[PDB]
């Protein structure tokens, strides 16, 4: 299979406006949401049909209780940060944990935190240590690194448990996650040549322009890979035409092991 990943995010807000949750936790496999929990529902719920169908109610019940506890811990942690930063008003706290299973069979794992949307603490599971970006993070680093057992627990969870969950979810959702829908690709003139692709899955795609068989990325405008809403994606890239000299321009698209070239006449 190609590369796949599993990750869980948390978001805490210290003084949220009316209605908005104080706490949200969402899991993803690749680009696909799989799970959701927030401080309003107080329930962990599936976000993909193949999760609902393959995980018995005991799974949602157990993790609902854990998430209620993680919610409270997140509040306490954010209260501590905002006191040590001496900040008033509403501030945000975020966490991301996850792993990747690469095509070649190797793995990665990661765990990090942010305050107001900026890196705060980053875990290194090989040195078993936390990187602190400032002295408020440094205080937290010292406390967390004093609990060596919990670092070892995170290493095992990233390297072993997370990968096992990911393989399990990949099988559950294999009809979605492991399919291929090839792009439909065309070239438009608008002056710049636009190379446009739509209808493809997975979202990972490489589109570029070559001029006389050479690539110059400094003159290519790369569009974002965007969801079309039906489970497929679209993307584009453009280069500007030289009005004083002809050139052989060609759009090159790579998607899921297939390469395509559109030479423009």
């Amino acid at each position: 299979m190609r590369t796949h990943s599993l990750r869980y995010f948390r978001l805490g807000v210290s003084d949220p406006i009316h209605g908005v949750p104080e706490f949200i936790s969402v899991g993803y496999v690749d680009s696909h949401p799989i799970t959701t929990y927030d401080s309003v529902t107080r329930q962990k719920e599936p976000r993909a049909p193949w999760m609902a169908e393959n995980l018995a109610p005991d799974h949602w019940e157990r993790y609902t209780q854990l998430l209620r506890g993680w919610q409270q811990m997140f509040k306490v942690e954010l209260k501590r940060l905002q006191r040590h930063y001496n900040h008033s008003g509403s501030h945000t706290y975020q966490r991301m944990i996850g792993c990747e299973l690469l095509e070649d069979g190797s793995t990665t794992g990661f765990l990090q935190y942010a305050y107001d949307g900026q890196d705060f603490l980053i875990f290194n599971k090989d040195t078993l240590s936390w990187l602190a970006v400032d002295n408020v993070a440094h205080t937290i680093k010292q406390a967390w690194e004093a609990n060596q057992h919990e670092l070892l627990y995170q290493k095992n969870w990233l390297e072993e448990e997370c990968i096992a969950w990911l393989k399990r979810f990949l099988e559950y959702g294999k009809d979605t996650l492991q399919r291929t829908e090839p792009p439909l690709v065309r070239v438009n003139r608008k002056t710049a040549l636009f190379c446009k692709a739509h209808g493809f899955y997975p979202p990972e795609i490489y589109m570029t322009w070559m001029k006389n068989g050479e690539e110059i990325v400094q003159e290519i405008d790369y569009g974002d890979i965007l969801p079309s809403g039906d489970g497929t994606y679209q993307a584009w890239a453009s280069i500007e035409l030289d009005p004083q000299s002809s050139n052989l321009y060609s759009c090159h698209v790579e998607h899921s092991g297939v390469h395509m070239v559109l030479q423009v006449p």
Partner: antibody
Amino acid sequence: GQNIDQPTEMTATEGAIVQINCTYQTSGFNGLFWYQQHAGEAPTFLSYNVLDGLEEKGRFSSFLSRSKGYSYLLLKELQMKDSASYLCAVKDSNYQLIWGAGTKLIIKP
Amino acid sequence: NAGVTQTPKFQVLKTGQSMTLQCAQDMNHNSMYWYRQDPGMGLRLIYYSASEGTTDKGEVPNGYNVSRLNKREFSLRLESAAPSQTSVYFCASSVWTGEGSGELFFGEGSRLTVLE
């Protein structure tokens, strides 16, 4: 069907070394605990292992092999106060703590 | 600084009698647990409380109920005692839960005997 197995009882002589084994078959693994429980008293925490290898704490060491699904608690220079039950417990993929039935350690003075 | 305080240490009950076991912890822990211990078996979780304001069934909840009264207190209720509930009951607490490495702190145990 998740199982944790450890011998019912072991008997050793004062001053010697004893190794208490615990094997586990669980759906996922988030670490292995040992607790000591004197007769008529509450269990108390002895050790936690989650990566492979041996960890020492005084006269007690605890070993773990994740691939073999096995741990031992090693007690050196046995004393009479080591007479107690020793409970092994494992956290599964759902953080459920699954308890072995305990090993009663009897020490001959 | 007392740790986990549970009561009563001993109790005899007639089948059908009601009983509440009390447990408090002064360690500012968030998670609390009620276990039963019987010969020849590992500890079995009856009910637990992952955080103040939530509780859930363990593996053997039938015949029992619990109340997480506040952050400190977690009571266990036998509404209609049965002979099968003769056991030694342990309350325990942990700083948090849903994490690998945090250990349990146990109370001294409550020995209940239920008789016809």
